[PDB]
Every structure is written in structure tokens, then in C-alpha cells.
Amino acid sequence: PLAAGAVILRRFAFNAAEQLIRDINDVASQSPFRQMVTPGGYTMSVAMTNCGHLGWTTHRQGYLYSPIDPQTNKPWPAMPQSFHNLCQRAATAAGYPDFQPDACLINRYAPGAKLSLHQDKDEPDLRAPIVSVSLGLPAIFQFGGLKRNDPLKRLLLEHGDVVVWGGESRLFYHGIQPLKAGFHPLTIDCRYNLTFRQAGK
């Protein structure tokens, strides 16, 4: 396959998108999007927030999952029903019926925003997949392999696409290329990505 252990489900979230986006807005009304600072001192171009019991954040110049939003000093908003349902349906179709995320990181891309190449290794159990849902403007996703120098492959992720990153692919280096400007009827001028994680012990 494209990436061993990954399951791409194009347009899987297409019908759910309008509701998901309403729920992104609701979460953000409580824990606002913010551009976090990397441990290296750089302000991320991607803006982020979280919902669920745990939320990914930079903290004391490292990263961690925290039950509290350090910007509001309140818990991250509860996981919306629409998020919970979509993630479970996707995980199940992909062969991970027991996947129980307790964190959802919500990434917002304005034109030009990108993610540099990296691995997702902050979770306690790397056998749990990550479920990724793309909404709005299309992005070029790049992913390599288990080594930083593995050859990259590229794939366009479009509105409604869901990828379940399990098995070996769960540990691949990956990133997102600078978002091209455009219009989408539901998000207007941005892309959102939801990544569901099992972050608790």
C-alpha cells in the first residue's frame, strides 16, 4: 500500500463536515485557537486547540498532554458527539474497533501555514492509531518512513478525507506543505484537521 498500516478513507467525513465545523467553532469559543511556540522558540504557523479529556500543548519548553488548557486555566472542552461518532466509525472501518481517543487536536491552517517534518511520538501507547480528518481547503501531505531521511511521498488531502494511521505508518515522519489560498464553502479560507489520539496511560 501507500503507507503500511494506513487506511485512507476519502470523503468519509464529507456528509458530517458541516456539523464537525460547527463543533470546531463551539470548542474554539471556549478554548480559542492559538499559535503555540515550539521548544526552539518559533511561533507555529498552524493555530491549534483541543477537546477531550487531554489536549496537546507545549509546556515549560517541552510538549505534553494536559487535562487543562494553559491559556484559559480551564479543562479543554468535552469531546463533541460528532467528533466522537465520526472517529469511532472511521477507526472501526479501518480495523481498530477498540480505539478510544481521549484527545483531539484541532489544527487550523491559514494560507501559507505548514507543519514541518516530524513524528508523533508523544503518546504512551504507539500501538494505538491516530485518526486524521481533513476539512476545508486541500493540503499536500508528505510522509516518509521510520527514518528522517526516508524518501518522501506526497498526497493531497481534501475536504472530508479521513486517514487512519496505524501499524508502521503510525511512526512515519510526516508534514504538511504550505497551504494554498482558496475558497471552500464551509470553512471559507482555511483548512482544519482533527487528529484523534489515545493520549492517556
Residue 130 interaction partner, one of Fe ion, ligand MD5, none, beta carbon < 5-8 Å per kind? ligand MD5
Q: Which does 82 bind (CB under 5 to 8 A by kind): ligand MD5, Fe ion, none?
A: none
16 touches 82 (CB < 8 A): yes
34 neighbors 71 (Cβ within 8 angstroms):
yes
What is each CA distance from 198 to 32, 106, 165, 189, in whole angstroms?
Answer: 22, 15, 12, 30
CB under 5 to 8 A by kind: which of Fe ion, ligand MD5, none does 107 bind? ligand MD5
Are 131 and 120 in contact by the 8 Å Cβ rule? The answer is: no
- Closest distance to Fe ion from the beta carbon of 70 (Å): 20
3-state helix, strand, coil in the chain (%, to 5): 15, 35, 50
- By a kind-dependent CB cut-off of 5 to 8 A, residue 169 interacts, out of Fe ion, ligand MD5, none, with ligand MD5
User: What residues line the site for ligand MD5 (CB under 6 A)?
Assistant: 105, 107, 115, 120, 130, 132, 143, 165, 169-170, 172, 174, 176, 193, 195
Separation CA 124–CA 200 (nearest Å): 7
* Cβ nearer to ligand MD5, comparing 73 with 135: 135
Cell of 146: 521510520
Q: Which is nearer to ligand MD5, 73 or 164 (CB)?
A: 164
> Residues marked as binding?
56, 63-65, 107-109, 118, 120, 122, 148, 174, 191-197
The residue sitting closest to Fe ion, measured at its beta carbon, is 120
What's the CA gap between 15 and 21, in Å, rounded? 11
For the bound state, the minimum distance from the C-beta of residue 132 to ligand MD5, rounded and expressed in Å, comes to: 4
